[PDB]
Amino acid sequence: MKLKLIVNGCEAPDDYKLLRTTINTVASLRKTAILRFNSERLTIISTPKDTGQLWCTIPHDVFRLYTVISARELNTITMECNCDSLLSVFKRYDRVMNQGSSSNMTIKLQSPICALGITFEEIVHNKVIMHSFKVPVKLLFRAQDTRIQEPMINYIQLMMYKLPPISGEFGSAFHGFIRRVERYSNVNHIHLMGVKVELKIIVNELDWHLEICWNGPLDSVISTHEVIIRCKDWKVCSKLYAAFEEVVLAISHDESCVFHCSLDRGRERGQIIYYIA
Amino acid sequence: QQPWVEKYRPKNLDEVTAQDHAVTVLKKTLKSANLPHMLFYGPPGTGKTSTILALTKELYGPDLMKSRILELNASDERGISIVREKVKNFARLTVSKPSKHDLENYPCPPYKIIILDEADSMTADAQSALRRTMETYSGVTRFCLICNYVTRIIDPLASRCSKFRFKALDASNAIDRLRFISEQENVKCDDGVLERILDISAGDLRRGITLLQSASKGAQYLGDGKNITSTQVEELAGVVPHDILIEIVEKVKSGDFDEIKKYVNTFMKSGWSAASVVNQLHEYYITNDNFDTNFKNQISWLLFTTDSRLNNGTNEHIQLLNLLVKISQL
Amino acid sequence: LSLQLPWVEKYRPQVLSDIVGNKETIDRLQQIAKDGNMPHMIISGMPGIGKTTSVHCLAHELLGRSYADGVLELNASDDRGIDVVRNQIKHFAQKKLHLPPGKHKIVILDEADSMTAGAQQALRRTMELYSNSTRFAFACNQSNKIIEPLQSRCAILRYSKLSDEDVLKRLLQIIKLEDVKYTNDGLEAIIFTAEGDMRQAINNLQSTVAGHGLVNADNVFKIVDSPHPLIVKKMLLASNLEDSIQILRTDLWKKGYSSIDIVTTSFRVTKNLAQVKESVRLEMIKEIGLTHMRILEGVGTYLQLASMLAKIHKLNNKA
Amino acid sequence: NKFSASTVHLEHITTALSCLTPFGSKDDVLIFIDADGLSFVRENNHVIKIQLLLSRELFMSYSYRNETEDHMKLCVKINHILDSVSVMNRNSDDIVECTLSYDGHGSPFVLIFEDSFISERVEYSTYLIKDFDTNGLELDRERISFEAIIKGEALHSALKDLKEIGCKECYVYAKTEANDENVFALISKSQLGFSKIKLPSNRSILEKLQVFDGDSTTVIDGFAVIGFFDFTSFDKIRKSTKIASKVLFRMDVHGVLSVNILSQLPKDYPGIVIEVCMLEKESIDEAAQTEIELLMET
Amino acid sequence: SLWVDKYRPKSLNALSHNEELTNFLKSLSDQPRDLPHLLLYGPNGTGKKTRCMALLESIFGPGVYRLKIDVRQFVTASNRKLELNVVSSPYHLEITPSDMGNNDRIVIQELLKEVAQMEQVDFLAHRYKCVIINEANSLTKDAQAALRRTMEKYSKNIRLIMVCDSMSPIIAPIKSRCLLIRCPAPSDSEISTILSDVVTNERIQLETKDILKRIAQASNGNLRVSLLMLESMALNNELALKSSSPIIKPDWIIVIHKLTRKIVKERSVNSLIECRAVLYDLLAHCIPANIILKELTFSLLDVETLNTTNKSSIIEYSSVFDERLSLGNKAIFHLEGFIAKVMCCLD
Amino acid sequence: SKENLPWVEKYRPETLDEVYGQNEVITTVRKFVDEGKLPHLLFYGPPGTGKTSTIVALAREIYGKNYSNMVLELNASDDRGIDVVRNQIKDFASTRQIFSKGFKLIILDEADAMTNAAQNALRRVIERYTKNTRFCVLANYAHKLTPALLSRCTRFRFQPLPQEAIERRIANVLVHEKLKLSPNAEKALIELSNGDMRRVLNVLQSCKATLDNPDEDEISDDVIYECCGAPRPSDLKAVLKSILEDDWGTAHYTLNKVRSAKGLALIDLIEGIVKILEDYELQNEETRVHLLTKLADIEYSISKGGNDQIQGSAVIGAIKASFENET
């Protein structure tokens, strides 16, 4: 049950910013989150159990230290933690490194309800200020842990589209495409479309009908594909794409939608999957 | 494929049978454009929803159907606020322009239709907000109210709507549709059948088609290739056999309370619905010639009271025992 | 068109001497207007007997030329919430307008029965603290709709239904100022159809003189009908069923009265019916309610009213 | 289609549309489309009416292929256009291009926005025209009691102060003196009591104040023009005065007030002519005007 | 474990009560494509739910008995944040909306309108999902009005098999769109045979097999009641059914019998107040008032000291007050009225 | 475009001279208009009597082309709450008249659907602004109106439409549609009308649709009875003769044959037999009581469903057991 990890944001900016990308998303989705500390990999889960589910994979090489032992299989212990407190602590460290510092995070599992001893250091300008925090968490049981499994997605003859990276010429154009529907206050359903490559945001209602289009180039690695989604999930998709260069969009015909995000750390790659029903 | 009730649902106004006083007017409406506000009322399973959904098709066409039709049933919210905003805004909406194909094929009337199915389940406050909506925008939109109990529609709303009563589908005017459906499904029936199915199902073609489907699904399960007889139809309909109802009658004739109570306790264990045994007793007592005028005059009111009490959702055992004990004291 | 006001507003009394009826109360109001010391009062009664024109005239006479900045009339058409009581009424009470000795500011809270509870509970403190300068004149139709602590500090003035002579005097004054031709039976019919309501007497007289000119029984009864409670009472107090069904049909069904209106009026008439045994009255109430339920459920037919009358006669003859 | 209009100055259209938001933001807006341009006529409770004027020179393109009819009237919900045109036209390298079109009756009003790589399209289904005459809420051209021209900033400050002090009711003064002195104040009845905001007589604020004898020709001095207006309707011009340089005020003897917002992008187009007609209250009270006069005396 | 849920048949061939009802369910399951909406009605404890499960097993194959329980949240107009457990499984869904209360409309308009608009297109046969509505007779006449069109329009992707007893308070439109399947209660011979199967399987030592017949006649055609009685008697007698084993009965039944004895013996106002106290005690235990009235009537009719006139008056008052309770709000008034009328008629 | 309208709305009286039936009300409001003083009006009557047409025609005559800016028509389709009463009606009444030199009109249709809170706030609005605005209240149920609002408004009763007015409107409709109506069919239409012109128009339109050639054929009584699905006047007396003169075996057969020849409904036969028996000279005073109290219960049970044959036999039993008293 002994859990201890060390994070250094300045040492590795990518894996650290993906950790910022995972925490902000689980804060924006809903309160509380599920953290399974597998001996080789971390996975941050927000299961509402219609509402979407996020499954972000975090490897073990991202942190300087990943000592994890438990009596369960593969040293797996699963936490339930209120996301507001850890988000506040994480923002505090963001301000700590913004003011100028290179200190690391010492996170230890100090004691079923437990807490994490997230302690770090900050220097103002050659002064020593110790920041100590304790976020109360609960220990998920193994029988409760196996009740949570990642949603499955198939494409017998469906269609995944390669979203252009945000660092390219068309990245800002596609970001504006995704955020264009977010400007309207009175929108609750968006109807995505798939033609094989064009994708359109259609919002048809009793007296008004949006039909936004993307006329730029698109890629689909290797038939109609339409789905009805909520606007908040589209906002989460916007936020996920804004922080990812490699974004994968797959659309199922009246079944589901999946927002796949991947960071090429090469090394195991960190991936974020947003299952949407 | 699909249940026979949905497979053989009328698609055009030429398959709605036995309602020749309300279909001819709607078909004359096809040529003109003066469709009035309609109030469809009648017994359940008479074809009102199968008539409006066919008239809408003939009037508009599949492509114009999604744009010129708004359907609101009891399965969605129809409160005073909903009537005041959604229905009013749809009525205020301008008539959509038909396409060239729609104009060249379908009549395309210059109005839209708001169908309010199961309007008897609407509160009298929400019904009062339609009174001026169906009159101010009567030239841009049309209204069709469908219900089974016309008394639950307020008089101001019933005044503005043309009333079309859908007749009960008995074995005389709905026999042709059942015989067409049976022949289309290769159902081999005896003589007398298809006239007993339409009699057990009193004024309801939906039940008369479901019972025929149920009788065929067993006939094709046995595999002997025999004709469906008039006893199986009652066996899957719930009609009490004429040997148990006879025991009921001959136990009523002997006015001993305890034996009647014991036989009713045994009878209720067989699962028979009281609404069917009361009906069969009504037929037996009214049609019999061994009972005088006073006995029938009292039995009519007794059976009427029992049926009215059973319609309110009461215990079948208590009401049936009370009815039979009262009959035994006549 | 024309600027000619309706006679209800054209002949609204502007002095306390022109308000007929309740002589013992109007005289006391005049005594208050002369002396000056006006206590907090609650004027209640039936509609149209002169409860508003009395308070307004009393305030006018009591304040003279200071009426514009000495009164604060808050009706139900204004937002008489708790915020208004806490701000506008408080600031009007805190005003230090100088008045002749004995005179006081008047807050005419007309239609105070529709005021909310928190507003009245704040009004409690408003009249508790600022009582030496401003006075509150509540005008209502039902005194029980004002909370008991507010009624404790006030003086209750119960206006009554106007008789057949005060209304006749006011009608004769109007007919003298409008040169209206009349006959005694027509004026008596107007009084009978008014039911102690001066407003509904003036309106009927104006309608009759506009439609026909001469005020006789025929010209009156051909434009304004006899009161339907008095026809429902005649229907419910008959002897035979064939004589009550006639008054039901030919006087309430072919005339245009809804069945629910007939039942609602029948309940009120039964509640006030006299010379009827209490068992008979409660049975009649039960039979009227059983038909009211059926009419409210949808079956508002003449057959149901006939059945209700038949059951009333059944309970009358033996039960 | 039968009508098409495109532009890039989305800020101007957004400012014009935001002047119709004070009148609810949850109802219907009626649009005129003729050769001169396109307008938004909005009325509330038949007591106040606001009318925009977007000239054809404002847009780069204005075709109006409707040869059959002189003008086209359509009725749509106002909130949706307010939300749509609020693109703020960011990323100045790629200017968001507007496209307004309307094919005719039965066709929806189209708002196509082009972001070079993005071409979104919004369709607004029109509603049936309510049987109301916009000519009712109009002022005389022969019965003007007074005509005043006031700069936008001072008037906007006056309305802001009136809103801040509550101002449940408002009054208007217009008196001209024979010694070229012109007085113009917005007297208000609020929680505070009796408050007066006197506009300065200098030509930088009061360019021209002329009081007539109900004939719009005579110049009578020493007379006063009194207009009792509900501040609920008078506050609707506050947002319109935030974009105006000069405001024209005209009232007649029949109790209607015409606030003419003069707003001063293409060179040919004059601007947004915003006209806010307003009805005067009946003012059954008679001593209130006497008190207004006495307050203006001292 | 409970012997009711440990010997429940899990197939159409393991259901031994009515050979005629199994041969009809097999005919229904032969061609599952055209399965109509079904309404199973019969006496309680017959096994209508078990036969529905067997039909679902014959249609969708095995795997209909692995039930996953999820709680769905529904919000009313007043934002009361109501609650309802939704027992579900592969290929079928089970709901008892009547438990939600008078707000069953808010669940039959959400669950039955969201699973009927899913089309169940998996990876191409859309098929249909069978929804079982337990206690279909407890709906408030507004859940059925919003259900008739729901199951009529979306019949392609959903099928409804409603389970109920005494289908009187079910409206005519619902019964018109549903195929009515009667489930008669087993005779004492079949119940005795089933109890014999249980006792040889459980290895309990019975003597005088007549005891199983006694349990069958005491259960009144209720397999659940008979099995619970058998288990209680075996456990209280240490797995040895002696010939004088006491046939245990529900406590509320004995209390209702004592109430009937008090009514027969004492007929006064104070006895009526004691009867009210007993009725309030029974009502505090969530026992339906209709069932209480039925038991009271059929226990007062079993008294051997009452003549035919008294029994006829009792049954007439029972019918009248049952109809009154069906159209009322507070049942204590109707129960007291029935008891007072019985007391007045007896003396 | 007026020919694509339903006959109910196509033949709406545009002027006050096209409103038939109500004469003492029209001839009073016309004198009110000509004199120049229009008091606060209340229009009461059964549905389809012509209240909403009379008030609109009166306002059109008063204002002419200024109808739009001087009439505030509010009905049950609008949220006529206390907030609306204080925020729209009050400022429509407060503002000065728009060029007409007279008064404004506020028409509150279906005022019986207004709440008591919104009706107790309109009283002082009516009283205060009487000089420059007037109020017309239209309702069919006067028990939902507050007594003070009923006292502030002059009451005009719209009687059910007489036979002569219905026949004179029928003549105009026949002239405009080039239709022909048999003398025996006009009486049937008037009898089924129950004083409602909307029923006249809605039945006549379906009668025209029923005719194969609407330019040569005539609308007989058979056409009307088939279109509206009502029992013939002979089928209502044959059933009663069988019930009151035959046995219990042939009366049932006659009833079920009458109800199956043309598919007639039980409730229509009940309401026809009631009207036929109301003219009877029953000399027991208990036969009438039994008939009413039993046929009303059967009518109430019919409205909630149930077995049709059981209720049909109950009608025969209730009519037979009642006349046993008379004999």
Ligand SMILES: Nc1ncnc2c1ncn2[C@@H]1O[C@H](COP(=O)(O)OP(=O)(O)OP(O)(O)=S)[C@@H](O)[C@H]1O
């Ligand atoms: N005249 C008819 N001709 C042919 N089929 C009919 C007719 N009347 C009813 N049906 C059949 O009855 C079934 C149900 O018809 P619907 O019109 O949907 O029911 P309904 O008349 O609306 O009764 P409700 O919904 O309880 S009010 C369908 O299978 C129809 O085909």
Ligand SMILES: Nc1ncnc2c1ncn2[C@@H]1O[C@H](COP(=O)(O)OP(=O)(O)OP(O)(O)=S)[C@@H](O)[C@H]1O
């Ligand atoms: N006693 C009276 N003397 C003279 N006119 C009267 C009298 N009572 C009522 N009126 C007339 O009634 C109209 C004014 O009614 P009000 O006095 O305002 O009614 P009210 O008695 O206050 O009833 P409510 O509460 O307002 S419904 C005018 O036409 C008056 O002339």
Ligand SMILES: Nc1ncnc2c1ncn2[C@@H]1O[C@H](COP(=O)(O)OP(=O)(O)OP(O)(O)=S)[C@@H](O)[C@H]1O
């Ligand atoms: N006296 C009449 N003369 C001619 N047509 C009439 C007459 N009365 C009613 N109608 C017709 O009936 C239609 C409906 O009547 P309306 O006046 O609009 O409603 P209403 O009579 O006021 O009934 P309510 O109370 O509003 S449901 C009118 O449009 C006319 O076509």
Ligand SMILES: Nc1ncnc2c1ncn2[C@@H]1O[C@H](COP(=O)(O)OP(=O)(O)O)[C@@H](O)[C@H]1O
């Ligand atoms: N054919 C059968 N053989 C053995 N037991 C049965 C059979 N049918 C029903 N049962 C018993 O009935 C019990 C369930 O009854 P239930 O389905 O609740 O009846 P109902 O549906 O009438 O309420 C089960 O425990 C089962 O043991």
Ligand SMILES: [Mg+2]
């Ligand atoms: Mg239907």
Ligand SMILES: [Mg+2]
């Ligand atoms: Mg008053």
Ligand SMILES: [Mg+2]
């Ligand atoms: Mg009307």
